[PDB]
Design a protein around this ligand. Structure first.
Ligand SMILES: O=c1ccn([C@@H]2O[C@H](COP(=O)(O)OP(=O)(O)O[C@H]3O[C@H](CO)[C@@H](O)[C@H](O)[C@H]3F)[C@@H](O)[C@H]2O)c(=O)[nH]1
Ligand SMILES: [K+]
Length: 452
């Protein structure tokens, strides 16, 4: 029996897609083991119980939180707040190498699918002649855009923050500004973050190949560009969440089709009260019906009497929303998102246009994919790459209101809903037998069966 070990980093945006990839391999009669940590194991155990479905095994590693100076309870990337904790977090995940090499010698699996943040996992798997696959959890376009920006540095031929530059080599003219790039790369360059990106991008060529959570038909110019111009060996097997298939739902049943906006900013939602306030003011001015998801830890971010003033039109969800069931409801016709790839794929899979609100990571590249290339989105005006949010950087009510109207009744809004409806169909087509993603998932497994 073929055995594949999955080693995601401890971040929700990477753990959930990695689990879905493990389920996909399990459905093809492949033994799948996921490596996690004790305080994260609940995320997988809960999500495994959703049967008669093949069994996915968990292996728990000790996270050296004390060895790197992290709180003992900091085993997840969403608790490492600030620059100091995040650098301590990546020193900690690096110390997992010993447990990984011990586990690889013990079990001797046929393949290691390891997170993009583990470039050294290629060497660790080589000690036992195990091929290593990289998983990023993002689009081909972000993979290509990150690499072209790293190699050609078009941000040095610029003189001011908002001065635009084109992305080299791309089959589309993509305009970007340095302000959308991390200051760690263009302002006060610190070798720490630059060497980590170098090792991550290099591992895509040094390893056996790349698993990509996308489908070929979604971004074919960049599925090819990644393989040919950038020389990577890759397989598009996404959307991986698809082949594994409440009060707010009753609230929507009585609503018009494609007239409600869904607002949710992911699992990494670090939202401050002044920013939530501008969103509340902008939602009121729009007049649009909405489902708004906020987090927890009350009048310090809400206008007085807000919930009661919009009771018949608006709903605020404070817990964990059933995002997939909400977006695929008929009433939902717009999605304000932070352009994380997992939720961007869910917007595409449901055929819902999006208001793009990038914050950090590769979200600004995903915004370009959604707005300029796929043309199913509208920018909100956010263009400042930042891990946390400064009150100086808050997006005001006026920008949010125009984006809420543009996505609902603005120019081409009915064509964007139509374009998203095809992408929806192509997404389900890609994952069924004979589809693009179903096909080279079989091609990856067959290649793994015959690795010498
Ligand atoms: O209230 C809620 C809130 C969330 N969810 C679910 O959590 C997922 C959110 O997707 P998302 O890509 O935004 O995850 P995130 O960790 O923030 O993004 C990082 O990981 C991404 C993957 O690489 C990366 O692209 C990005 O830059 C990173 F920031 C998505 O699958 C939802 O279904 C929910 O069900 N209910
Ligand atoms: K090349």
């Amino acid at each position: 029996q073929l055995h594949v070990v999955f080693f995601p980093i401890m971040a929700h945006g990477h753990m959930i897609p990695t689990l879905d990839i493990a389920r996909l391999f399990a459905a093809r009669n492949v033994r799948a083991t996921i490596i996690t940590t004790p305080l994260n194991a609940h995320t997988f155990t809960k999500a495994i119980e959703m049967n008669g479905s093949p069994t996915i095994h968990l292996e728990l590693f000790k996270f050296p939180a004390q060895d790197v100076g992290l709180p003992e309870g900091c085993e997840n990337l969403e608790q490492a707040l600030g620059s100091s904790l995040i650098e301590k977090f990546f020193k900690g995940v690096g110390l997992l190498r010993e447990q990984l090499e011990a586990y690889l010698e013990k079990t001797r699996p046929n393949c290691l699918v390891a997170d993009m943040f583990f470039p050294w996992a290629t060497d660790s798997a080589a000690k036992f002649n195990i091929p290593r696959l990289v998983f990023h959890g993002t689009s081909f376009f972000s993979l290509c855009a990150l690499e072209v920006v790293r190699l050609y540095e078009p941000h040095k031929n610029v003189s001011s923050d908002e001065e635009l530059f084109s992305l080299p080599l791309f089959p589309h003219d993509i305009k970007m500004m340095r302000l959308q790039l991390p200051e760690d790369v263009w302002k006060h360059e610190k070798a720490e973050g630059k060497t980590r990106l170098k090792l991550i991008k290099e591992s895509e060529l040094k390893s056996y190949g790349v698993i990509v959570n996308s489908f070929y038909e979604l971004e074919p110019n960049y599925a090819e560009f990644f393989r040919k111009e950038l020389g990577r060996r890759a397989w598009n097997i996404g959307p991986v969440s698809l082949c594994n298939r409440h009060e707010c739902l009753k609230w929507l049943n009585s609503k018009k089709k494609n007239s409600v906006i869904y607002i949710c900013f992911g699992s990494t939602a670090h939202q401050i009260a002044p920013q939530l306030y501008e969103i509340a003011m902008a939602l009121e001015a729009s007049g649009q019906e909405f489902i708004w998801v906020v987090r927890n830890n009350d009048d310090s971010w809400l206008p007085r009497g807000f919930e009661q003033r919009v009771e018949g039109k608006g709903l605020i969800i404070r817990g964990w929303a059933p995002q997939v069931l909400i977006l695929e409801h008929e009433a939902i016709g717009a999605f304000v998102t932070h352009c994380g790839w997992n939720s961007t794929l869910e917007g595409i899979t449901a055929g819902v246009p999006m208001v793009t609100w990038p914050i950090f990571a590769e979200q600004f590249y995903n915004e370009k994919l959604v707005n300029q290339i796929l043309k199913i989105g509208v920018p909100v005006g956010a263009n400042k790459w930042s891990r946390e949010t400064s009150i100086e950087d808050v997006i005001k009510k006026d920008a949010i209101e125009k984006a809420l109207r543009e996505i609902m009744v603005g120019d081409e809004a009915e064509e964007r809903r139509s374009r998203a409806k095809k992408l929806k169909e192509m997404a389900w087509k890609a994952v069924e037998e004979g589809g693009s993603s179903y096909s080279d998932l079989s091609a990856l497994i067959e290649e793994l069966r015959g690795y010498h």
